[PDB]
Every structure is written in structure tokens, then in C-alpha cells.
């Protein structure tokens, strides 16, 4: 019937003044644009069919053509930025926002999907969708006593579109829009569907990726305990965005980091720092590095949770990027920690892996490791045990690495190695 039409036939049908022929041609276009391989989006655009689809979006008396044109425009807007721009230039944003209130659930769902693609293009189209007033009807769609009454796919599409309205920076979403959306985001973060939870966590991670004021807007809503609970989930698609958000939050003030700590997040890091997924380990180690850059009582809470041995383990064996994040964590620990905490770190066996990592080609990790070594040496001096630390570094083959680093291209590494050797070796 409407399978495998040519663009010529689709154009001939849509250009007829027969609404049923137009509907059949629009469905043929939808089916063409829904094929797995090489959807002819550019050909459909060159034929000048976007204005006709946008006009069909407004035929309240023919809901089937509304649905077919909405699906076709959704698939066009899912492509490159130029194709999404073609959809937007056809005037599709206000038409989709009007369809959001359609009495037909599938048409409203398709409008949500299309707006999600458009907003997901980038900050400009995100803010333009917001200016046309999409947030109010979108949130009204979710104004129900219990989210479980809504169709699953419908709720998933709504959550994903809301996440795209929270996405992207330079600039970040409008503050009034973020405040308008956050309550519903919290409610969705307490929903039970794995995909809804994943997309809500992604939205929260987008919102927490910014200055301290954005992080504060998020944490004021009291979502940190739920974020930690989800950090403990078994589905990796949930743990990933939840860990993302928790790390973002700990990049802020010491009080926000303390909110993360009080929620019990540290107790999850034994698993996260040993997680089979390399990305989880890297994100967890970066989060730990930002937590060790906090107050001394926060470093002490890291110690009490037994996480220093896990940092030693990550430093000893892991992907190189995770090892670099662990080196950063150790350097922050030593810069902010007390003498007792630093000597405890030494007692856990940090010297040997920290020295083995000095054979890396990355210059920044060398600088970080040398700074950590200098801080540990300052602590030892404060205790008068600098000779013990010197022999400890010599026994694991570290003094040779430092002497070799004296002859390094970078000036900072040169000077740091020279100073270490002249002052302690």
C-alpha cells in the first residue's frame, strides 16, 4: 500500500488536493523515514515537504494525518543539525506545542518526541522551544496523582524530553525554567521504571554540571539521598548518570559535599572503585579526588569508610585515566590532610604504586605525583621521619625515577625533581 514509495510519488500525492491521498502519501513518507538504513531525509527536504507536513500538523479534523506528519517530522528532526533546523524553520515548534494538548495520546506522545529531538539539537533550539512555552503543557501532561497510571512509553518519552530541556551549557537552561521543571524531576526520580530513573538521573547530572548556584538549586530539593540510593542500583544505565550527578555535586562547596557524605555515599565506593566498567571506576575515582579536596573531617570520613586501601588499589592497577584520577585524589588528600592522615596514607602502601606511576609519559600525572611526594615529605619533616620515607622511596626504585626526571623537558618537573633530590636525597 504505502510501502517503498518513491519521493516522486510522495510529492505527487501530497500535492493533490485530496486529503486522503495526502494522508496515504504522508504515511508512505513516514515509512520511508522509519527504515533502519539510510533514511532519505535530505531528499524529502529538497522536495519541499516540510511545510506541508507542518500544515498537516494543524488538521484537527484528520488526526491520522496529524500523527503521520508528526512522526515524519520527528524522524527528520532526529538527524543532523541542518535537518533539525529545516524542521524548525518550517514553523514546527508551535505546531507541536499545540499538539501537546491533543486528546489523542499517541499524537501528544509524538509531539513530545519531536520537541525532545529539537531541544536535544542544542542550547539555541532548547531555549527557543522554551520561549514558545512548551514547559507548561509538558509538565501538565505529568500532573497526575500517580505516575503509574500513565502508559510506560509515554512517561519515558516525557522524561527524555524533559532531560533534553535540562541539557547543554554555554548557556545553561534558564534558571526560571530549571526551577519550573525540578519538582517534576524529583517526582520522576522517585519513579520505579528503570528508563525513567536513568533519564531523570541524566537530567539531574546536566543540571548539577555548573556553578555552585545550580548545584544548590538541585540539592535544595533534597534529592541527594535518592541519588545515593540509585548509585547503589544494579542497572548500569542508572548508576552511570547517578554517579555523574554525585560527582558534579561534590565539585561544589564543602557543605554540598557534606550533604553527599551524610547521605551515605562513601559506603558505595568500595564497589564503584572496583566496578568492572572502566567508566564507572574513572568517575568514582574522580569523585573521590574531589572529596579528598575538602575539609579535614571529610578526609577523615573517607578514612573511616576504609576507602584509602581502595585508592591504593586503583593506583596500583587500573586504566591509566583512572590511575591519573587516583593520583589527583592522593595529591589533594596530602595537600589538605593532617599529618596523622598522611602517615596513615603512607602506612596503606601508597609509595610503591605512586612511584611506579612515575614511569608514565603523561607530564601532568608526573607533576601531580611529585607534588604529592613533596607534601608527604613535608609531613615527614614535621615528624622527623624524613629519612625513613627516603629509604622507603629508595627501596621501591623511586629515587632512580626522580633522578631521571631531573632531566625532563618540562620545567616544573625538572625543578620539582631537583628540589626533592637536593632536599631529601
Amino acid at each position: 500500500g504505502t510501502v517503498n514509495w518513491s519521493v516522486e510519488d510522495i510529492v505527487k500525492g501530497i500535492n493533490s488536493n485530496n486529503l486522503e491521498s495526502q494522508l496515504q502519501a504522508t504515511q508512505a513518507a513516514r515509512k520511508l523515514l522509519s527504515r533502519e538504513k539510510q533514511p532519505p531525509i535530505d531528499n524529502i527536504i529538497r522536495a519541499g515537504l516540510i511545510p506541508k507536513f507542518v500544515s498537516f500538523l494543524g488538521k484537527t479534523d484528520c488526526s491520522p494525518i496529524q500523527f503521520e506528519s508528526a512522526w515524519a517530522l520527528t524522524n527528520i528532526a532526529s538527524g543532523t543539525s541542518e535537518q533539525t533546523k529545516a524542521v524548525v524553520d518550517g514553523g514546527a515548534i508551535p505546531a507541536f506545542i499545540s499538539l501537546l494538548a491533543s486528546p489523542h495520546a499517541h499524537i501528544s506522545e509524538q509531539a513530545v518526541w519531536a520537541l525532545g529531538n529539537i531541544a536535544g539539537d542544542g542550547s539555541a533550539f532548547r531555549d527557543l522551544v522554551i520561549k514558545h512555552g512548551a514547559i507548561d503543557p509538558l509538565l501538565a501532561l505529568l500532573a497526575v496523582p500517580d505516575l503509574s497510571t500513565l502508559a510506560c512509553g509515554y512517561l519515558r518519552n516525557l522524561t527524555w524530553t524533559l532531560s533534553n530541556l535540562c541539557r547543554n551549557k554555554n548557556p545553561a537552561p534558564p534558571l526560571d525554567a530549571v526551577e519550573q521543571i525540578l519538582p517534576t524531576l524529583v517526582r520522576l526520580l522517585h519513579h520505579n521504571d528503570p528508563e525513567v530513573l536513568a533519564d531523570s538521573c541524566w537530567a539531574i547530572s546536566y543540571l548539577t554540571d555548573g556553578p555552585n548556584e545550580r548545584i544548590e538549586m538541585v540539592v535544595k530539593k533534597g534529592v541527594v539521598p535518592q541519588l545515593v540510593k540509585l548509585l547503589g542500583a544494579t542497572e548500569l544505565p542508572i548508576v552511570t548518570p547517578a554517579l555523574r550527578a554525585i560527582g558534579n555535586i561534590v565539585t561544589g562547596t564543602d557543605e554540598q559535599t557534606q550533604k553527599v557524605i551524610d547521605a551515605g555515599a562513601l559506603a558505595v565506593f568500595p564497589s564503584l572503585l572496583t566496578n568492572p566498567k572502566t567508566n564507572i571506576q574513572k568517575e568514582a575515582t574522580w569523585t573521590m579526588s574531589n572529596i579528598t579536596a575538602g575539609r579535614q573531617d571529610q578526609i577523615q570520613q573517607v578514612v573511616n569508610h576504609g576507602l584509602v586501601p581502595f585508592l591504593v588499589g586503583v593506583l596500583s592497577k587500573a586504566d591509566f585515566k583512572t590511575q591519573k584520577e587516583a593520583a589527583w585524589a592522593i595529591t589533594n588528600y596530602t595537600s589538605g590532610g593532617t599529618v596523622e592522615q598522611i602517615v596513615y596514607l603512607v602506612h596503606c602502601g601508597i609509595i610503591e604504586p605512586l612511584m611506579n606511576l612515575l614511569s608514565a609519559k603523561d607530564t601532568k600525572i608526573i607533576q601531580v605525583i611529585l607534588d604529592a611526594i613533596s607534601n608527604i615529605f613535608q609531613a615527614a619533616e614535621k615528624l622527623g621521619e624524613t629519612e625513613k620515607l627516603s629509604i622507603m622511596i629508595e627501596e621501591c626504585g623511586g629515587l632512580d625515577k626522580i633522578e631521571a626526571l631531573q632531566r625532563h623537558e618540562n620545567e616544573s618537573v625538572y625543578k620539582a625533581s631537583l628540589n626533592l633530590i637536593e632536599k631529601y636525597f
Binding site: 522509519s34 512522526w71 532526529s78 533539525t84 525532545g116 529531538n117 536535544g120 533534553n164
Partner: peptide
């Protein structure tokens, strides 16, 4: 990101 309906 974007999603195409198949």
C-alpha cells in the same frame, strides 16, 4: 541527543 522512531 536525538531518537528516531522505527
Amino acid at each position: 541527543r536525538k531518537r528516531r522512531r522505527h
